Amino acid sequence: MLKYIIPTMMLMPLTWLSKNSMIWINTTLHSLLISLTSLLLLNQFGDNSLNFSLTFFSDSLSTPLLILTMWLLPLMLMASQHHLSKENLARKKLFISMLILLQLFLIMTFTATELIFFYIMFEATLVPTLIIITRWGNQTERLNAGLYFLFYTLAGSLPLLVALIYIQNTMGSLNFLILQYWVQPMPNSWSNTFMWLACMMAFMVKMPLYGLHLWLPKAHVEAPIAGSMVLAAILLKLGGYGMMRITLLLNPITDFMAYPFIMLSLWGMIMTSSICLRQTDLKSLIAYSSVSHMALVIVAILIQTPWSYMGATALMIAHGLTSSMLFCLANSNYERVHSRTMILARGLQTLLPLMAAWWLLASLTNLALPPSINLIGELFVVMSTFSWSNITIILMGLNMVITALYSLYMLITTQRGKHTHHINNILPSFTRENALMSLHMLPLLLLSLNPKIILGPLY
Amino acid sequence: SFPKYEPSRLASLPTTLDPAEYDISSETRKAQAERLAIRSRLKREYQLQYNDPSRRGVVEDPALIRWTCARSANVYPNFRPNTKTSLLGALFGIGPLIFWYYVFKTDRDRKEKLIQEGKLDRTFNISY
Amino acid sequence: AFLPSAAYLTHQQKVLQLYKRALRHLESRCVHRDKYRYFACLLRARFDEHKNEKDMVKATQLLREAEKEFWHGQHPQPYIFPESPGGTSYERYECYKVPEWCLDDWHPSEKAMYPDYFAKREQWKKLRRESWEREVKQLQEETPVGGPRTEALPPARKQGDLPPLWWHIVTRPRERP
Amino acid sequence: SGYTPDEKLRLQQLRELRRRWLKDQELSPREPVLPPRRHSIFAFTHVLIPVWIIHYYLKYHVTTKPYTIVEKKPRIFPGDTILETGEVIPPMKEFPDQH
Amino acid sequence: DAPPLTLEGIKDRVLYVLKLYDKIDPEKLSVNSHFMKDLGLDSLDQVEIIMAMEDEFGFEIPDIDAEKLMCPQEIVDYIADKKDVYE
Amino acid sequence: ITKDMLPGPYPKTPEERAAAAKKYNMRVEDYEPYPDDGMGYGDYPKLPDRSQQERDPWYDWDHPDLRLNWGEPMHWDLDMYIRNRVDTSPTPVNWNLMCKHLFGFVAFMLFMFWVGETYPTYQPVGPKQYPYNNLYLERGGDPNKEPEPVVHYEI
Amino acid sequence: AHIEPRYRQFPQLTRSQVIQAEFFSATMWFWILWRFWHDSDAVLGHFPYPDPSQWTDEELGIPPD
Amino acid sequence: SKMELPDYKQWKIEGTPLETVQEKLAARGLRDPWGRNEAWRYMGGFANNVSFVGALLKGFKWGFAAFVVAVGAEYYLES
Amino acid sequence: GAHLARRYLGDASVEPEPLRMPTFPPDYGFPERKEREMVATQQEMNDAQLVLQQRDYCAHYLIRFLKCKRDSFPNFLACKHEQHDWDYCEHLDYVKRMKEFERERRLLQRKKRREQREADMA
Ligand SMILES: *C(=O)CCCCCCCCCCCCC
Structure with a gap:
């Protein structure tokens, strides 16, 4: 994995030794070249994972997340070069360096064969995200959003480290390749109960879980566009990856332990969809939809069946792409009308036809229209949770209706009806914005042709 | 004689059947007078700010910003924990969670108990 | 009691609106023209019988009982004109009523396809x-x-000037764009 | 009540301006000044070429793989003759006629 | 479909509908003839005139605009403004 | 915008009530805030709770799509009472009579369906007779187990 | 060329559509009459219905005692 | 562009049920001033509409003739 | 249709039920009854791909009709005579079923008369 870390670190001498106004072009070009070279991680075998050295290894689970991250960085640079045109050159270089550092920590998180190294990078992703949210946001509440985002996550992750250190004093090693062969059954006791809680609550917090999700509507709607992309599409998958790595050591105590969290997520999807039915803000609507989808992924991981794991990783990739597209749509509308109210700018189909087409396509992929990978993941999770119990399908099925009750609603209030009369600064769609939405959507529509590369490490 | 209309929550009383509309007292006429005055002043301000040729942007409505701020950021400072709010929160937060936990635990226990004795039909169920 | 120019509805306007609504619902009740004409003459007799009633509270009570009578026997689905609100064709063409200021955002290449129209637009601006x-x-x-x-807005009381706030009413899109 | 004279004058001036604006919406005969720039084509480029393409695809790439195109067997009636090996299916038993 | 309407056509149609009214004798009315004073009509007759024009032209005039229409020239101008004639 | 135009706590003194009524651009006598039961509403007014379909459609509204003016105070549930959503128009028939009629109709036809299921209708024929022991081999039966001989006789 | 609209009189008709409408109505009635003449069994009844009470006792195997 | 209108004086209610309405009102005691406006629907080419049974039997004569001709033709060819 | 009124509004102990027939033995009252004969062979019925409900006691007429329909393409109205033969055969089968129903009803009535006579003598 040294062939991907070194160009990412060399991106900083590229962005600091560049010209007065050539930073965006050079960074976008070289990050797109890194994204092109990222496809060499598809050397996967049916039995063996790809092991590079004693520190870095790549299974079939970390590979789609790595490709998504290195694909997301140029899109991020394209998205965050319109509201920073008035910024200082040094501050612009600092923002680009923050994005590069965050991407470096993200691609070093997924390949870590040691759980301590994985945890270290998993908390090292906090500092650039917090700095971006608290510095380059727009509202006042970002300062409050800098606290709820931080002290939630550490409150889940500081006990967990202790539990990880306990494994270092118990099994003798924390290497994931070793622990696949030296694993032991976990007997039912209060000590193993609290060790399960310590090892899981960090990933329930960072996913998030219903009840612990309070930081996500606050850290999504004050953050800038790049921060919204990094929270929605990547940083919510660290919890899922950590769950999938750590569920191996927590057997067979998980069978009777996962019940309250399964009930919490199965009711939280309905609660967050109902909240989406009455939200007055576009950004908060997208945040609560993200909460609902990640609660679904939590259920899929907790029931731990192969179909559930496949649906979980497919849902993770599909939700990341769809939420990134929806956040970029919301950012374009916010840049055009200078407000976040849903009811303010109506009837935009009569003014922007192509943006209306992009809105319709994104809302189509949000409610999991087949044969998109959203439907693939959600369908497989539904099959697995029907195998788990025969009643949960009801708690799935009703949720589906509410999804189709808000996404199209998020379309209609923003696209259809009579246009407002007192708004006359509606510019035509720029080429950069349309390029951004096409680069967001065309991989998502192309992945329906060959979904076997995003179906987890047990395909 | 004729069946009188019963007002409902989702079926309001007709405007032409309202007895209070037919009052021709002085106070109702005065109230309509300053209601029309307030509406006319607001409309005049809006259409003066709206027909400006130099303006190219959004005519900001303080009512919309007021409503959006009251809906989201002004809920907790106006909240006091009392009997009604605690009862509603206990009924709506942990009620359905307990109900669904009991339902799913009972169903899973029955299914597992059927599985151990071999009564459950699993002749072809090999994908899980 | 919601009017653009006035603050209330007088008695005469209430009686006239009740008569118009009753005649429309009566036309909806009987399909054919001759039966509607017969019953419209009957309703005109019923309204003309109590025309010269100088007692004001008796007129108010007659209005209340006539409103109750109309509410008792109105059609469940009255006839609605297609362009009237609640009709089949109501606000249908609002998806084609593009505002004029979009022409300010047109490219100069497509602005050269209509030179004289844009010259007149510049004169209007x-x-x-x-x-x-x-x-x-x-x-x-x-x-x-x-x-x-x-x-109510004042007119143009001088020579050479225009009535105030005339732009967005004159330059509104047509009913059939 | 009728038309108040002040708003009657306003309506008259507004109508005059609206009529002038509607008159200005017409086009000159020059506008729009545009920038300067086989009977069986549909039976060939829309039927014959896709038929060739997918007949090649079915003959040499679908039927190559096993169990892709599976067909219901043809119906065999008494009195018929098999083309594959020439066997004749014997006719049925003599009917106990009723009419 | 939907043939265009001119001011001459609208004035001819409103004069036709007013001429087919038995309360108005055809030899006295003019296009600028008031209903209440020049012709001696009634408010109910004004409502009947308004709904007759509504049924003739196939579109509904609101009551707040119907109460201020009292002369055929005003009706012609109102229908002309609503239908956007003379373009 | 400024600080003393945003909503605040529940008004208690009449001067605070008058200031809140002036802030919300209506009369003091028509300014009725939500009751201070601790539900979080604050000083937001309690509008008469009717849908936007009941508004005048012929008025020159500032927002004719929603039938709302500029600067007028919005309902707390304005996103519920839009024309795309729940309507509270006055029905020609009372609500209780409609509900009772619909429930009686559904219940009566369900009861009569159950009664007709109890007593079905048919035609005066016997069971259909199929050859070869009721087609034992054709019903997927195993050829090793010889079926019980079922013989049908001519009538 | 086209049909000019008329005011409160009968509309101008085309001979071709009148001929086509009469031809299609005549074809419908001819088809109905022809099928009723030839088939005639799908309406009135394909087969006679015997009376169940008319069957004799000895052909039903009723033992007389 | 120029639509000429017919004469207003021909629209009389004679031969129409509007005179039946007029007789009923005159027996009761009132007037119907709008008969001449609606007189155009009951006179001219819109008068004497067919009944329902005559509507269902549209084109029955030619169809019966064609059926008789075809039956005779098939009787000739069957011999 | 009168049998529904005789069974529901009358007495159900005499009217036979369609769910289970026959209750009387087939050799009771019938001296040396004869069984129905199958003409179509099981193999011929098998390779003709007949529907299982279509495999009644005279499916040979159906086989002949299907062969004629297949061999007279595209004249779809050529040989309706085979269809008429098949319809006549299934009508005869329905007549046989009606005869069986009437036999069961008459035997049930006879049994009721027998027990009524036993009640009379005792
Ligand atoms: C014998 O009377 C029973 C017939 C079948 C059950 C009743 C069917 C009723 C509907 C069909 C006949 C309608 C006659 C007008």
């Missing part, structure tokens, strides 16, 4: 921007203390 301050000074010197009382 010059007229509006040269009459705006005159009409806003007319408005600010005619509105009484404490704001306007009604929503």
Whole structure:
């Protein structure tokens, strides 16, 4: 994995030794070249994972997340070069360096064969995200959003480290390749109960879980566009990856332990969809939809069946792409009308036809229209949770209706009806914005042709 | 004689059947007078700010910003924990969670108990 | 009691609106023209019987009982004109009513396809921007203390000037764009 | 009540301006000044070429793989003759006629 | 479909509908003839005239605009403004 | 915008009530805030709770799509009472009579369906007779187990 | 060329559509009459219905005692 | 563009049920001033509409003739 | 249709039920009854791909009709005579079923008369 870390670190001498106004072009070009070279991680075998050295290894689970991250960085640079045109050159270089550092920590998180190294990078992703949210946001509440985002996550992750250190004093090693062969059954006791809680609550917090999700509507709607992309599409998958790595050591105590969290997520999807039915803000609507989808992924991981794991990783990739597209749509509308109210700018189909087409396509992929990978993941999770119990399908099925009750609603209030009369600064769609939405959507529509590369490490 | 209309929550009383509309007292006429005055002043301000040729942007409505701020950021400072709010929160937060936990635990226990004795039909169920 | 120019509905307007609604619902009740004409003459007799009633509270009670009578026997699905609100064709063409200011955002390559129209548009914009301050000074010197009382706008009382706030009403999109 | 004279004058002037604006919406005969720039084509480029393409695809790439195109067997009636090996299916038993 | 309407056509149609009314004798009315004073009509007759024009032209006139229409020239101008004639 | 135009706590003194009524651009006598039961509403007014379909459609509204003016105070549930959503128009028939009629109709036809299921209708024929022991081999039966001989006789 | 609209009189008709409408109505009635003449069994009844009470006792195997 | 209108004087209610309405009102005691406006629907080419049974039997004559001709033709060819 | 009124509004102990027939033995009252004969062979019925409900006691007429329909393409109205033969055969089968129903009803009535006579003598 040294062939991907070194160009990412060399991106900083590229962005600091560049010209007065050539930073965006050079960074976008070289990050797109890194994204092109990222496809060499598809050397996967049916039995063996790809092991590079004693520190870095790549299974079939970390590979789609790595490709998504290195694909997301140029899109991020394209998205965050319109509201920073008035910024200082040094501050612009600092923002680009923050994005590069965050991407470096993200691609070093997924390949870590040691759980301590994985945890270290998993908390090292906090500092650039917090700095971006608290510095380059727009509202006042970002300062409050800098606290709820931080002290939630550490409150889940500081006990967990202790539990990880306990494994270092118990099994003798924390290497994931070793622990696949030296694993032991976990007997039912209060000590193993609290060790399960310590090892899981960090990933329930960072996913998030219903009840612990309070930081996500606050850290999504004050953050800038790049921060919204990094929270929605990547940083919510660290919890899922950590769950999938750590569920191996927590057997067979998980069978009777996962019940309250399964009930919490199965009711939280309905609660967050109902909240989406009455939200007055576009950004908060997208945040609560993200909460609902990640609660679904939590259920899929907790029931731990192969179909559930496949649906979980497919849902993770599909939700990341769809939420990134929806956040970029919301950012374009916010840049055009200078407000976040849903009811303010109506009837935009009569003014922007192509943006209306992009809105319709994104809302189509949000409610999991087949044969998109959203439907693939959600369908497989539904099959697995029907195998788990025969009643949960009801708690799935009703949720589906509410999804189709808000996404199209998020379309209609923003696209259809009579246009407002007192708004006359509606510019035509720029080429950069349309390029951004096409680069967001065309991989998502192309992945329906060959979904076997995003179906987890047990395909 | 004729069946009188019963007002409902989702079926309001007709405007032409309202007895209070037919009052021709002085106070109702005065109230309509300053209601029309307030509406006319607001409309005049809006259409003066709206027909400006130099303006190219959004005519900001303080009512919309007021409503959006009251809906989201002004809920907790106006909240006091009392009997009604605690009862509603206990009924709506942990009620359905307990109900669904009991339902799913009972169903899973029955299914597992059927599985151990071999009564459950699993002749072809090999994908899980 | 919601009017653009007035603050209330008088007795005469209430009687006239009740008569119009009753005649429309009666036309909806009987399909054919001759039966509708017969019963419309009957209703005209019923309204003309109590025309010269100088007792005001008796007129009010007659209005209340006539409104109850109309509410008792109105059609469940009355006839609605297609362009009337609640009709089949109501607000259908609002998806084609593009506002005029979008023409300000057109590219110069596609602005050269209609030269004379855009020349006339530039003349219209010059007229509006040269009459705006005159009409806003007319408005600010005619509105009484404490704001306007009604929503009625004053006309153009001078020679050469335009009525105030004339742009968005004159340049509205047509009903069939 | 009828038309108040002040708003009657306003309506008259507004109508005159609206009529002038509607008159200005017409086009000159020059506008729009545009920038300067086989009977069986549909039976060939829309039927014959896709038929060739997918007949090649079915003959040499679908039927190559096993169990892709599976067909219901043809119906065999008494009195018929098999083309594959020439066997004749014997006719049925003599009917106990009723009419 | 939907043939265009001119001011001459609208004035001819409103004069036709008013001429087919038995309360108005055809030899006295003019296009600028008031209903209440020049012709001696009634408010109910004004409502009947308004709904007759509504049924003739196939579109509904609101009551707040119907109460201020009292002369055929006003009706012609109102229908002309609503239908956007003379373009 | 400024600080003393945003909503605040529940008004208690009449001067605070008058200031809140002036802030919300209506009369003091028509300014009725939500009751201070601790539900979080604050000083937001309690509008008469009717849908936007009941508004005048012929009025020159500032927002004719939603039938709302500029600067007028919005309902707390304005996103519920839009024309795309729940309507509270006055029905020609009372609500209780409609509900009772619909429930009686559904219940009566369900009861009569159950009664007709109890007593079905048919035609005066016997069971259909199929050859070869009721087609034992054709019903997927195993050829090793010889079926019980079922013989049908001519009538 | 086209049909000019008329005011409160009968509309101008085309001979071709009148001929086509009469031809299609005549074809419908001819088809109905022809099928009723030839088939005639799908309406009135394909087969006679015997009376169940008319069957004799000895052909039903009723033992007389 | 120029639509000429027919004469207003021909629209009389004679031969129409509007005179039946007029007789009923005159027996009761009132007037019907709008008969001449609606007189155009009951006179001219819109008068004497067919009944329902005559509507269902549209084109029955030619169809019966064609059926008789075809039956005779098939009787000739069957011999 | 009168049998529904005789069974529901009358007495159900005499009217036979369609769910289970016959209750009387087939050799009771019938001296040396004869069984129905199958003409179509099981193999011929098998390779003709007949529907299982279509495999009644005279499916040979159906086989002949299907062969004629297949061999007279595209004249779809050529040989309706085979269809008429098949319809006549299934009508005869329905007549046989009606005869069986009437036999069961008459035997049930006879049994009721027998027990009524036993009640009379005792
Ligand atoms: C014998 O009377 C029973 C017939 C079948 C059950 C009743 C069917 C009723 C509907 C069909 C006949 C309608 C006659 C007008």
